[PDB]
Ligand binder design. Sequence first.
Ligand SMILES: CN1CN([C@@H]2O[C@H](COP(=O)(O)OP(=O)(O)OP(=O)(O)O)[C@@H](O)[C@H]2O)c2nc(N)[nH]c(=O)c21
Lengths: 20, 7, 749, 151
Amino acid sequence: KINNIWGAVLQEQNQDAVAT
Amino acid sequence: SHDLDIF
Amino acid sequence: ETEDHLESLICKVGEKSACSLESNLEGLAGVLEADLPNYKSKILRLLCTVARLLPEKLTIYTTLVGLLNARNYNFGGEFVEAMIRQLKESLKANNYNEAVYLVRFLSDLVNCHVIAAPSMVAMFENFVSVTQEEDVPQVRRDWYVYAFLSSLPWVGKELYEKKDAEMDRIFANTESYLKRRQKTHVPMLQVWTADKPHPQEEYLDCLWAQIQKLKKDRWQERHILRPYLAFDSILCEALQHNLPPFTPPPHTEDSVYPMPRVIFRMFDYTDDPEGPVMPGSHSVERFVIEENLHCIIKSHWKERKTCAAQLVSYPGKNKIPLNYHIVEVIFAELFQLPAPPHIDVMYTTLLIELCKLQPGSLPQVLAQATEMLYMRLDTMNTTCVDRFINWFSHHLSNFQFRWSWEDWSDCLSQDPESPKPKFVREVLEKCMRLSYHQRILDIVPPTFSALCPANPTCIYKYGDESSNSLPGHSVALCLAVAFKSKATNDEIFSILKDVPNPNSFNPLKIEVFVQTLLHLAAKSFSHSFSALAKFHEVFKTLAESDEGKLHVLRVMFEVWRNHPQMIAVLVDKMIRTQIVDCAAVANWIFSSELSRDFTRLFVWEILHSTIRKMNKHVLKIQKELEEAKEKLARQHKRRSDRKDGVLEEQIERLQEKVESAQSEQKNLFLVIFQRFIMILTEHLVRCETDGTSVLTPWYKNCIERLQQIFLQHHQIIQQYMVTLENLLFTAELDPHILAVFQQFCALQA
Amino acid sequence: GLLKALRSDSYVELSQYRDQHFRGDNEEQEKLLKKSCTLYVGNLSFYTTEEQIYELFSKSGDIKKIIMGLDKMKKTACGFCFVEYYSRADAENAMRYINGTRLDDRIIRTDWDAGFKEGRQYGRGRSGGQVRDEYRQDYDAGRGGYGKLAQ
Ligand SMILES: CN1CN([C@@H]2O[C@H](COP(=O)(O)OP(=O)(O)OP(=O)(O)O)[C@@H](O)[C@H]2O)c2nc(N)[nH]c(=O)c21
């Protein structure tokens, strides 16, 4: 199982940065 | 805050 | 403008360009040939500089030299003469890293038909014969053999096909030497003591195995880039030069050689079942990859963005799993002993930038590496464990403290002192330090609540109703009201001169005063700092005796035994403000009041911070003395070409201050080592009497903390070696403890 | 000597911010900046206590002093701080690595400062907070909420 938790965190942070 | 830090 | 244009041209070649590398090399060669008659020395210096400071492009910069030699024999000869002068100066200077890069440059220059193979073979014979020298440190021999072996991956084929007889003689001599080397230092340098799944073998052993496998493979690596191969047609006819007979500089007492290191291996080809087959742990391609990545990191350690860009765009003859290699090299630098090449935060920021640049693949590799590192925590060194905890806590802070904690459920059932649950506890505590308790609770699964740290609240012994019967409660209340009323120092003495001594040191007095002061200043760091600075006089008058300082430290611990960061900061301020000397804190660290918290990371971060403070103070006083002496010399010379008297007096005073500071540093280190020896000796005697296993987590932590202190401060302990061996680390000492000292001595001998 | 490409230190370079209330010419301010040890840390949350700021900035070296950015009248945090290290090298390391790192899920931005003088810790904004907090219009929970102009 590829732990991709930080890929999801980076995606969320990029979404927040785009929203800002 | 008088400069006590001599060490 | 001319010099800077030449420098920009030379440095530019091999980077982002619309043309191939060969075309750029030919263009640069031509340009330099045009500017040869008017900037011969400038070009020579620039080339020797890029050769000495840019190993990660070594082969490229040799192809240029291979072309210029084909154009100007004289130029080539002068260049090699300058390179041998630079090598001799780097050796007399003790700049052996630069010297080995220069040796690599010469070795790969043999492949461009600049240097005749027999001359380089003779030079290597001299290098190996260095191993036959008598009464020289083994580090010298190690480095001289390392240079040859490390250069072999670049010119081995040429040397063998030209002088196989002398090459075989050299190899026989090298084997005869390596069979009789001393490996005492390996245990102190291994990141993992376990022999599976990746043994942490010494660098010379690894390199020898790699060279033996390359020789068995008819000297063929499929990784190194060799642009000069395409220029063969122009290079075959070029004339070759003969290096002058080289004699290594004789050994001198002041000479300092690099300490041996241990290869950090953590991955395997099975870890990437989809990407390109990772080179084997004993393949020379792997060594070249790690060396190039290390050089790239060391050449751009200031610009984290540029460092990440260079790492991600690392070229190779054949495709390789570059993400895994970058992660491994970064962890190797981070987890390298005695200390990393650069500040530990650089690696964290570089990894963050790398993840940002390549979010699609690298973050998964980082998570896999993290899981691997956690699975192999049962033997990792506690210094590397501390570095891992700090990096991982910072990473979680930078990623909304998100991690799959359930995957580590195996740690919930283990002994809480086991490396795994202990690592989890420390990570959670560090995460709390960058956040608040409630958030940390909210993020971990409920089943992990038993590991979560404690709320950082002050413990006022005289705050509860049940405290009315405690001695000094009335004095505590009077001090509290006086503090709330902005009382002056004399008033506080008046309210304090009435504390009944239990029997010029009243423990109850210090306890009450410090409990009250800390409690009233327990809403912000700045508050505490102001309360400590304002009442400085009271502190210095109540804690005149070292026992008084120890009592102050104990009371401070009791008040804030739940806020380690506050403890740390307070101790720091107390040692900088001169409320407590460093010796008192060192004695306090080993005090019984910390036995339950002896293994906790904050006590050792405090001890290391105090040691660093003492070292910096000593260095500052020494620098001031040196500056004063220089000013005296300059003034005397200018006058020769009252004042002098008073200046000389000053100088004398400063010298006495430096002597006292060095004495205090020596006493600090001596006390620390004595306390380590005492605790380890008593523990070993008790364990032997009980007939129990000597290998316990507490013992491992203590022994590896001693190793950490030796590794961190070898630079200073080199001066005390004599007294350390004569008084503390004697033959009568237990072999387990003396082993650490023997390893430390062999580290540079 | 040494290649200028390696000497490039884009993170330790002076910013375009010059103090407007400084008592002196720009030249001496630059002189101080080239040898100062104080960093102005901006883009902080109001709730950010100074213990976590100390825990983050103590990773680059021994900190000497921390001054939180109090409000002019409310005497509450406004989202900026001054960190004074003990050595120049520590400040340079903090700028090279701590600059642009997250804290409380907020991208902090450290800059050089010409030193600390009494009265600098209060936000120049006539509302009490920070001028950027008075001009911004986007909502931000960590910065109280809507800008002072919005209310
Ligand atoms: C943006 N700021 C703000 N600041 C300091 O923060 C305090 C309050 O400044 P402020 O309320 O942002 O006003 P001002 O400096 O005029 O901001 P601006 O020029 O962005 O409009 C002062 O001590 C000021 O010097 C700064 N200090 C330094 N060194 N560098 C900076 O970029 C900044």
